[PDB]
Amino acid sequence: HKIKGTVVLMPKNELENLNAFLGRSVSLQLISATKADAHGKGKVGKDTFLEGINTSLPTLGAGESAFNIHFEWDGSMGIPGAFYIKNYMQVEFFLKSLTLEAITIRFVCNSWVYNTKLYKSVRIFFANHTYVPSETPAPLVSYREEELKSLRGNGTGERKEYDRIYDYDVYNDLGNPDKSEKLARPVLGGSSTFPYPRRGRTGRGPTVTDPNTEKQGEVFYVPRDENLGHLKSKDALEIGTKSLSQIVQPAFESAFDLKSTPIEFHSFQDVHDLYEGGIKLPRDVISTIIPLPVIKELYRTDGQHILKFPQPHVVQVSQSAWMTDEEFAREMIAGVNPCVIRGLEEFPPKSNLDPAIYGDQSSKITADSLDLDGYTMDEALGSRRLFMLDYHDIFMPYVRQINQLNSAKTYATRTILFLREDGTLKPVAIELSLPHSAGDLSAAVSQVVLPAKEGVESTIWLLAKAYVIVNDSCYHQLMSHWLNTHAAMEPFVIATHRHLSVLHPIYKLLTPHYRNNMNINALARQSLINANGIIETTFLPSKYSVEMSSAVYKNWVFTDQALPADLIKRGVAIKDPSTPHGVRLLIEDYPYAADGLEIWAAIKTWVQEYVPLYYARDDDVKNDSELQHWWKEAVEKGHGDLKDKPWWPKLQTLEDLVEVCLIIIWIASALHAAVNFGEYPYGGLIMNRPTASRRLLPEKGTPEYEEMINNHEKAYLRTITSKLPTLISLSVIEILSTHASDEVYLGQRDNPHWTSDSKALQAFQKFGNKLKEIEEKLVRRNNDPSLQGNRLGPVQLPYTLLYPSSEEGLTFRGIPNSISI
Numbered sequence: 001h002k003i004k005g006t007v008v009l010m011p012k013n014e015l016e017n018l019n020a021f022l023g024r025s026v027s028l029q030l031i032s033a034t035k036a037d038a039h040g041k042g043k044v045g046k047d048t049f050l051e052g053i054n055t056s057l058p059t060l061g062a063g064e065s066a067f068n069i070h071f072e073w074d075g076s077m078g079i080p081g082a083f084y085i086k087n088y089m090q091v092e093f094f095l096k097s098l099t100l101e102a103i104t105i106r107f108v109c110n111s112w113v114y115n116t117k118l119y120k121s122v123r124i125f126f127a128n129h130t131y132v133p134s135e136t137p138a139p140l141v142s143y144r145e146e147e148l149k150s151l152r153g154n155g156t157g158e159r160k161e162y163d164r165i166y167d168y169d170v171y172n173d174l175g176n177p178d179k180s181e182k183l184a185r186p187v188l189g190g191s192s193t194f195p196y197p198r199r200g201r202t203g204r205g206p207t208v209t210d211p212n213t214e215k216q217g218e219v220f221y222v223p224r225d226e227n228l229g230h231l232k233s234k235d236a237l238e239i240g241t242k243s244l245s246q247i248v249q250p251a252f253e254s255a256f257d258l259k260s261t262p263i264e265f266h267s268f269q270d271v272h273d274l275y276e277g278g279i280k281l282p283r284d285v286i287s288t289i290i291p292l293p294v295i296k297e298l299y300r301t302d303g304q305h306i307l308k309f310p311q312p313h314v315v316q317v318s319q320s321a322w323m324t325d326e327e328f329a330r331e332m333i334a335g336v337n338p339c340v341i342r343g344l345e346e347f348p349p350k351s352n353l354d355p356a357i358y359g360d361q362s363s364k365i366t367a368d369s370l371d372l373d374g375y376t377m378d379e380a381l382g383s384r385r386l387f388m389l390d391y392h393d394i395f396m397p398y399v400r401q402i403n404q405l406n407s408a409k410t411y412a413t414r415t416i417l418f419l420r421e422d423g424t425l426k427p428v429a430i431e432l433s434l435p436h437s438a439g440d441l442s443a444a445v446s447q448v449v450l451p452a453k454e455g456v457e458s459t460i461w462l463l464a465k466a467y468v469i470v471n472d473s474c475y476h477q478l479m480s481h482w483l484n485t486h487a488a489m490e491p492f493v494i495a496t497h498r499h500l501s502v503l504h505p506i507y508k509l510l511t512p513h514y515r516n517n518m519n520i521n522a523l524a525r526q527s528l529i530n531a532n533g534i535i536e537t538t539f540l541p542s543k544y545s546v547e548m549s550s551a552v553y554k555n556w557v558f559t560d561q562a563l564p565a566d567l568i569k570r571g572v573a574i575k576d577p578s579t580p581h582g583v584r585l586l587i588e589d590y591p592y593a594a595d596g597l598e599i600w601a602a603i604k605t606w607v608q609e610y611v612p613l614y615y616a617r618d619d620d621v622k623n624d625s626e627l628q629h630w631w632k633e634a635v636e637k638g639h640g641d642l643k644d645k646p647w648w649p650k651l652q653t654l655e656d657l658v659e660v661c662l663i664i665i666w667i668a669s670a671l672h673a674a675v676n677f678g679e680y681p682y683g684g685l686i687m688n689r690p691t692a693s694r695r696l697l698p699e700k701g702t703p704e705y706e707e708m709i710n711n712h713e714k715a716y717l718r719t720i721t722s723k724l725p726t727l728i729s730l731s732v733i734e735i736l737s738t739h740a741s742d743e744v745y746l747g748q749r750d751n752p753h754w755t756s757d758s759k760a761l762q763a764f765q766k767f768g769n770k771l772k773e774i775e776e777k778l779v780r781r782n783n784d785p786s787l788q789g790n791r792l793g794p795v796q797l798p799y800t801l802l803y804p805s806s807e808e809g810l811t812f813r814g815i816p817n818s819i820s821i
C-alpha cells in the first residue's frame with residue numbers, strides 16, 4: 001500500500017535543525033479525489049510523519065530541505081488529489097511542496113504552516129490540477145468550498161499574523177486622532193464625498209477619540225502568505241519605507257535642527273554634490289543609517305560622516321539637459337509619468353470649473369503669441385499637432401487650501417505642446433492659474449509664461465516649468481502610481497482569494513500578478529500615505545494629498561485602463577482597424593505608447609489562448625458560480641463606491657472575461673512598471689522632478705524679483721522642495737526604483753509546475769518567447785538614430801522601461817508580474 005513522497009520545506013530561519021522535523025513533529029494525511037465517504041467527501045488517510053532527510057537531488061536550493069515520507073494508500077483509496085498537514089512544532093515553517101511518485105502527482109504549496117493549535121481547521125493543500133467549478137472531482141467539491149469559506153472569515157475580529165482571512169475595509173486607518181487632532185484625516189471610501197477603492201481588513205478596532213477611525217498598530221496585518229519572506233535581507237525592499245520614516249527621517253532632522261548642515265541648497269552644484277562627493281552628516285547620524293537592512297544599500301559611505309547617493313540616469317551623460325525645453329516635453333511621453341498628455345482640438349483650451357467659485361476661467365493664452373514653427377493655430381489644430389498637459393481643472397479646486405499652508409504655494413497649470421515636423425514635442429506656453437474670489441487677501445494673479453532663453457524672462461520660464469512639474473509629480477505619485485496601480489488593484493486581489501479556489505484556472509492566471517501587492521500596500525498605509533507620513537511630509541499637498549486621490553477616483557473608469565482605450569480617450573491616438581494594434585498614434589514616436597502596445601498585444605494573445613482552454617462558450621462563463629461571485633464582489637464591494645457606474649463589464653461572455661483579465665494583468669505589470677521604475681532615474685535630480693513648490697512668482701520691485709535676475713539658481717531652489725524633504729524623498733524613490741533579486745518578471749512563474757495542464761504550460765511558454773521577441777524589437781528602436789529625439793533625448797537616456805527583462809537593482813528596465821514595490 002505504499003506511496004513514496006518527498007516534502008520540501010524551509011525552516012523559519014531561512015526566509016527571515018532538520019532532525020527536529022522528524023519523529024512526530026509533522027504529519028500529513030492524503031485525501032482522495034476519486035474515492036469518497038458516506039457524505040461524498042474524499043476519504044482521508046492515516047497521519048503520516050516525516051521519516052528522514054533526503055540528501056539526493058542537487059536541484060534544491062533556496063535554503064530548502066527535502067524530507068522522505070511514505071503513505072499507506074491502497075488502490076482502493078482512489079487517487080490522491082489533496083492533503084492535510086499538521087505542524088506539532090512550536091515554530092512555523094514554510095511548506096514548499098509535496099511530490100508523490102508511482103500513482104507523478106505534484107503539490108505546489110508555498111505556504112507558512114503554523115503550530116496546529118493556532119488553526120481553527122487543519123491546513124489543506126490541493127494537487128496542481130486545474131478545474132472550473134463544474135469540473136471539480138465530486139470528492140473534492142465540499143473541501144473546495146470549505147477552503148473558500150475559511151478564507152473569507154466572518155468579517156469580525158482582530159486579524160493575527162498567522163490568519164489567512166481576506167476581507168475589505170475603507171481607508172480609515174491613515175489618521176492618528178488619538179495622538180493629535182491635527183493628525184485626524186477623513187475616511188476615504190464609503191461615502192459620496194470620498195469614494196475610494198477598499199483595502200484589506202485588519203480589524204484593530206476604533207481609536208479612543210473617533211469610532212470611525214481604526215487605532216494604530218505596530219504591525220498592519222496582511223493574510224500570512226501575502227507577507228513575502230526573502231532569502232536575502234537586502235531584497236525586503238518593502239520594509240524600507242518604515243525604517244525611513246521612523247528611523248532615518250528623525251536622524252536627518254536632528255542634523256538640521258543642530259545646524260550641522262546648511263538648511264537649504266544654495267546652488268545647483270549643492271544638489272549635484274549629493275551623488276558626487278556626497279553630503280557630510282554628524283557621526284551619530286551616519287551610525288544610525290549604516291546598519292539598517294535595505295537602507296544601507298541606498299548610499300555609499302566612508303562609515304563616518306559621508307552619505308553618497310547614486311548618480312541618477314538622467315544626468316549620466318549631460319547634467320544640464322534636464323533644463324532644456326526638449327527634455328521637459330519629451331518626459332511627457334517617455335518620462336516617469338508618460339500617460340497624462342492629451343490632444344488639444346480647440347483653442348483656447350476650456351475649463352469645466354464653476355466661474356462663480358473660481359472667477360472667470362477663460363484661458364489667457366493667445367494664439368498669436370505662440371511659436372508653432374510657422375503653422376497657424378488652425379493648421380496646428382487640424383493636423384493634430386497640438387497637445388496639452390492639463391492640470392488646470394484637476395488642481396484648481398485645491399489651490400486655495402494648499403496655498404493657505406505654510407511653505408506651500410502652487411498654481412493650477414496648463415502647458416501647451418506642439419508636435420514639430422521632426423516628430424518631437426516642444427513646449428509653447430504655460431498658464432499658471434490661481435482661483436479668484438471676493439475678499440481674497442492675496443494679490444497674486446494668474447499669468448501666462450512663454451519660452452525664453454535669456455534674461456530674467458528665461459528664469460521666469462524655468463520657474464514656470466518647475467510649477468508644472470510640481471503639479472505633474474503630485475499627480476504622478478498620488479494618481480498615476482498610487483491610485484491607478486496600488487489602490488485600484490487591491491480589491492481584485494481580495495476578491496480573487498475570497499471567491500476563486502486555488503484550483504480555479506482564473507485564480508492561476510491572475511494570482512502571479514498580485515505578488516507582494518497587499519503587503520506593500522499595508523506598509524504604505526502605515527508609513528507612506530499616513531498622517532505625517534512620507535508623502536505628506538515631502539509633497540506639495542501635505543495633509544490634502546490622499547484625499548485629492550479620492551476626488552480623482554470619482555472619475556476612474558476600469559475599462560479606460562486598457563491601453564488602447566486610454567490612448568483614444570486622451571486624444572493621442574485614433575481607432576484604426578487597418579493597423580496591427582487597432583489604433584493609430586498621433587505622436588508616431590511616443591515611446592511609452594509604442595512600446596506599451598507591443599506588451600499589451602502579447603498579454604492579450606496569452607489571455608486569449610488561455611481562456612479557451614477552460615471555457616468553450618459564453619454560457620460556460622455565465623455558469624461559473626465562483627467567477628460570477630468573484631466579479632460581483634470585486635465590483636459591488638471592492639470598488640463598491642462606483643458600483644452605480646454604467647461602464648462595468650458584465651462577465652457573461654468569453655469576450656468580457658478576456659477583457660477583464662487583460663486589463664487586470666496590464667495594470668499590475670506593464671502599467672505599474674512604466675510609472676514606477678523611472679522614479680529615481682528621472683527624479684533623482686530634484687530640479688528635474690520637484691515634489692513641492694513653496695512660493696509663487698515674485699512681484700517686480702521686490703528683492704525676490706531681484707534675486708531671479710542676480711541668482712537664478714537660488715531663486716529656483718528657494719521655490720522647489722527644501723533640502724531636508726529632498727533627502728527623504730530621494731531615499732524613498734531610490735527604494736521604489738530598485739528590483740529585488742528574487743523578483744518574478746512578466747513571462748515567468750515562481751514554479752514550473754503551477755498547473756498539470758500541458759496546453760496551458762505550452763501557451764505560457766509561447767508568451768515568454770513572444771516577450772523575448774518584443775525586447776529585441778525595442779532594442780532595435782532604441783538603436784534607431786531616427787528615433788533618438790524622443791527615445792533618448794538630450795539626456796541620452798534610452799527608453800528601456802518597457803523592456804520585459806532585467807537583472808536586480810536600479811536598472812530603469814524590467815516588467816515585474818505585479819505591483820511588488
Ligand SMILES: [Fe+3]
Nearest residue numbers: 486676819821
Ligand atoms: Fe509602486
